Amino acid sequence: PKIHYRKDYKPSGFIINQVTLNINIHDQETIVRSVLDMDISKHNVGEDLVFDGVGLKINEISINNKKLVEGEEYTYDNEFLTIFSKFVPKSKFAFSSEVIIHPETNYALTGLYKSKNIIVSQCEATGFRRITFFIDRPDMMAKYDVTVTADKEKYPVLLSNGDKVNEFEIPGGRHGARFNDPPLKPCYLFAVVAGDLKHLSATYITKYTKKKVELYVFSEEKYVSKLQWALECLKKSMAFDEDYFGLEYDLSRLNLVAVSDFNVGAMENKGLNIFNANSLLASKKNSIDFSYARILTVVGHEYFHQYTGNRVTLRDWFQLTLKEGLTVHRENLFSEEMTKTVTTRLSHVDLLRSVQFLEDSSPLSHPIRPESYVSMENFYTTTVYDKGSEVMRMYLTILGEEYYKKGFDIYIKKNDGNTATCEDFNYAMEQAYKMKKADNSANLNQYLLWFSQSGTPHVSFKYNYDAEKKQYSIHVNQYTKPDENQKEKKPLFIPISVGLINPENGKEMISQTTLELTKESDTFVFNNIAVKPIPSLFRGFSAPVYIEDQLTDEERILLLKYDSDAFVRYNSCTNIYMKQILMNYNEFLKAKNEKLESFQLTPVNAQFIDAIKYLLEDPHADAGFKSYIVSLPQDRYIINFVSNLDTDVLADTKEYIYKQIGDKLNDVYYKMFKSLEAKADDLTYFNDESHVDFDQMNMRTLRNTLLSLLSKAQYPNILNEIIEHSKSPYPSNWLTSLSVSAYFDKYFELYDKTYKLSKDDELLLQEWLKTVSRSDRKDIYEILKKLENEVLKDSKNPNDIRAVYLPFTNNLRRFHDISGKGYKLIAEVITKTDKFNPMVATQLCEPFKLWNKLDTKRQELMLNEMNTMLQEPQISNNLKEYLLRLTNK
Numbered sequence: 001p002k003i004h005y006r007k008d009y010k011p012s013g014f015i016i017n018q019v020t021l022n023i024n025i026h027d028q029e030t031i032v033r034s035v036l037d038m039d040i041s042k043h044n045v046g047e048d049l050v051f052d053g054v055g056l057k058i059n060e061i062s063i064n065n066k067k068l069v070e071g072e073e074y075t076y077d078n079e080f081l082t083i084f085s086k087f088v089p090k091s092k093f094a095f096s097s098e099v100i101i102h103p104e105t106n107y108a109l110t111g112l113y114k115s116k117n118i119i120v121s122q123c124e125a126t127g128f129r130r131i132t133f134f135i136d137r138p139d140m141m142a143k144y145d146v147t148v149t150a151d152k153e154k155y156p157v158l159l160s161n162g163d164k165v166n167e168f169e170i171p172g173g174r175h176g177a178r179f180n181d182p183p184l185k186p187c188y189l190f191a192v193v194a195g196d197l198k199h200l201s202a203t204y205i206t207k208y209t210k211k212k213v214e215l216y217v218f219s220e221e222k223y224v225s226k227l228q229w230a231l232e233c234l235k236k237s238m239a240f241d242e243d244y245f246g247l248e249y250d251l252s253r254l255n256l257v258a259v260s261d262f263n264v265g266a267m268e269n270k271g272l273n274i275f276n277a278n279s280l281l282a283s284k285k286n287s288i289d290f291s292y293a294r295i296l297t298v299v300g301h302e303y304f305h306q307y308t309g310n311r312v313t314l315r316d317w318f319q320l321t322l323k324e325g326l327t328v329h330r331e332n333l334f335s336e337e338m339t340k341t342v343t344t345r346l347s348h349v350d351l352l353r354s355v356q357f358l359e360d361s362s363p364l365s366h367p368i369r370p371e372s373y374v375s376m377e378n379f380y381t382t383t384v385y386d387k388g389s390e391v392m393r394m395y396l397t398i399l400g401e402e403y404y405k406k407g408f409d410i411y412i413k414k415n416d417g418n419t420a421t422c423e424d425f426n427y428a429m430e431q432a433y434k435m436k437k438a439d440n441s442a443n444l445n446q447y448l449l450w451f452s453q454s455g456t457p458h459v460s461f462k463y464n465y466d467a468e469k470k471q472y473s474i475h476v477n478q479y480t481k482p483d484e485n486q487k488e489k490k491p492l493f494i495p496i497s498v499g500l501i502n503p504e505n506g507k508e509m510i511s512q513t514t515l516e517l518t519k520e521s522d523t524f525v526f527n528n529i530a531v532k533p534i535p536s537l538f539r540g541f542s543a544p545v546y547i548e549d550q551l552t553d554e555e556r557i558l559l560l561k562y563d564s565d566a567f568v569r570y571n572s573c574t575n576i577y578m579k580q581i582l583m584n585y586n587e588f589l590k591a592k593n594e595k596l597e598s599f600q601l602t603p604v605n606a607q608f609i610d611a612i613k614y615l616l617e618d619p620h621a622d623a624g625f626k627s628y629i630v631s632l633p634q635d636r637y638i639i640n641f642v643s644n645l646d647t648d649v650l651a652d653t654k655e656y657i658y659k660q661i662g663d664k665l666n667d668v669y670y671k672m673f674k675s676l677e678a679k680a681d682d683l684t685y686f687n688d689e690s691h692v693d694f695d696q697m698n699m700r701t702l703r704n705t706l707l708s709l710l711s712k713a714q715y716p717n718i719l720n721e722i723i724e725h726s727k728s729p730y731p732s733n734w735l736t737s738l739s740v741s742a743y744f745d746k747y748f749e750l751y752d753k754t755y756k757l758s759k760d761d762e763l764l765l766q767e768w769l770k771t772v773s774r775s776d777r778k779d780i781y782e783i784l785k786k787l788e789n790e791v792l793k794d795s796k797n798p799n800d801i802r803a804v805y806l807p808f809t810n811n812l813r814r815f816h817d818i819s820g821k822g823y824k825l826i827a828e829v830i831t832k833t834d835k836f837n838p839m840v841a842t843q844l845c846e847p848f849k850l851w852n853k854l855d856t857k858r859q860e861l862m863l864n865e866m867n868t869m870l871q872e873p874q875i876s877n878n879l880k881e882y883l884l885r886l887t888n889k
């Protein structure tokens, strides 16, 4: 099993200057003819010519138009084509081949495949080798000349990278299109699409060069009415890159294409971005609210890759975070500016500290630039993406906007048209740092540890105030726990955005201040501090760390009410919740262990409940923020703070705390649920797909959150509200009516009603499936069986499989049933999926990531299912590799 090491990078002994492809699509097979115009590099030492080529059927291979013969001049083992060096030319030469591949039965959705009636490619990371022979690595840059042919009736729309330079008819009802793409590119950015596609289009005129860019968004005919918001988002993306970064699109045309079957969200193929339909298509009648921000982020994300990934590309795959962490960061800047809601940044942090923190304290922990890999298909992680983005964002926090923009432009101008590494980016940032600090002696060498060191730093605080001296001190410590990647962890460059709040009037006591913590510990002192402040720490979540604020709940409540920073207010609330959760958890655990007949629980802080009421009742406060404060921290955030977590005891703990708060605030909840209706459910723009109001959507989130709290509580006659909610035109509302009805006799009536509403739109039905999957039902296993038999069946669509099973795995009480029946069920699905799509099978492993954090019975149960999956004779490379790492084997 080949392990690739970052330190082993060496450039190829060969060069590929030109790729000329003929892709001929037929009913039962696809024939690919390829001529590679090649050369010998200065690094060549007379080695064999070895091409990647996976699952290819060879019809012929030639060098300089001379047929090569198997055995004597070459060998092929279904993974590598080896041409013996005595037969390899010493100067420029042409290599040609004709292979047969079979998109129809390509269910792994890598290489060239069929999604419904669309032929489509996915080449990142090493999928191009499933299409034709190549030296399949991103430093092998080449020009591409691509001809596609196909039955005209089935496949009237033909697309690839570059300009369409010819279209022609072919005898027998066929037709072709030729695309020439002169700029050099790595092969993972090659794409081809063929199908009966329908489109919306527009023309965009660039800000500075005033170039006309044609924008096309494509889908199957059935869903063409769902393309409009995507086009709006594309225009928005282009404008933001122009306005913030001064960057314009360089090509005459940009195509976005939705396909039903896709392993991830989307792919940034040059001039031909290809999307999971769930991340490109929406309409207000047929999509939940979440689709709108999803499409905005994903369209934005693929667009921003045109610079950070496409024009400036990767030397090697170990540099993945250089294009993904940076493009996620650009996408976050964009979406924050587009939505103008504080919950956009909060939602990113919420995801990082639950999902990515879990990963980073799991056996799978890695730095954002790993040292090795076996499977690229398993490399695309929340660590590389989301911790990557936080590391890219810290440069902005450290430099400020002006010098960050200067540094970023240095990176682009210096590396445009080339491969690059993480060091190139740090170097560019460092140049800006020298300018900002006004001495060329300043450096960011310590910053590189963010790329190489794994694990989440813990940052903790102590304070001192001298009332006579008017002198305030913040003592800060950082610590990262040793793990498998470093025995000794080094201190990082941690930027701490801080404010000081006057507790008497809630005002700022100092100007904007970013503490630069560069040692294991430091003391930051402030003079002329007139009164003892409450510190506002890591404003905007200014570093990806565990924050231990060492504040009292009284101080935290003051910040929650009066601080200026949304994240610190949100975090202060989170910290109050966590102190309560840990306390009640231990009390419940003790009662369980000692088999107590009676015991006490510590009630929720009443001033805290009063603070929530205060904020909820404030008509000038933000609805999205309001929905965060009435929600306990995510289970996957909580689990980072508890050893041997008994999921039952945690379920009882959450139940107690929600009941405590609802016993005081339910009337407030109910009043708000009713008063929010007019604005939240306003239909004025329901038939305008260009009008998206993120505040209004946050009001609906708040109503739907409140409705859930009231339904769980069995608030008097809340079922009436539920039934009326089911008649709302907004799918976020009527799907919510299904999940909250779980607590009532009406559940299966709403199940049928909402099914009938959902069944004729592919993506809406997947949303319905998710809603059922995550329904708080005691009969949820019986319900899942019904979904399998009646709706899911033997679908190989990753959207269908993920929709049915993943939401259920977050059911704390039932997925973690002490019998192990939920672990058994998800392992059976993983093994079944692994037969045809190893990448998605490993995605479906996600609930096992925390296995060694649970109580010892559940650790044993999970480990048993993982060992069972590992023992499957036909297990894929992906899944084997992943489970071996996860189980510390």
Ligand SMILES: O=C(N[C@@H](C(=O)NO)c1ccc(-c2cc(F)c(F)c(F)c2)cc1)[C@@H](F)C(F)(F)F
Pocket: 109, 110, 122, 124, 125, 126, 127, 263, 264, 265, 266, 267, 268, 298, 301, 302, 305, 324, 376, 377, 378, 380, 385, 839
């Ligand atoms: O869709 C995502 N990421 C893709 C991306 O970065 N688009 O710009 C992405 C694209 C391709 C792959 C990928 C990697 C492989 F190794 C494959 F085999 C494969 F089929 C897809 C993974 C993630 C999500 F991270 C996002 F962006 F949040 F939606």
Ligand SMILES: [Mg+2]
Pocket: 054, 055, 056, 057, 100, 101, 102
């Ligand atoms: Mg094959």
Ligand SMILES: [Mg+2]
Pocket: 207, 239, 242
């Ligand atoms: Mg503009």
Ligand SMILES: [Mg+2]
Pocket: 260, 762, 797
């Ligand atoms: Mg389908």
Ligand SMILES: [Mg+2]
Pocket: 363, 484, 885, 888, 889
């Ligand atoms: Mg290990």
Ligand SMILES: [Zn+2]
Pocket: 268, 301, 305, 323, 324, 327
């Ligand atoms: Zn990306």
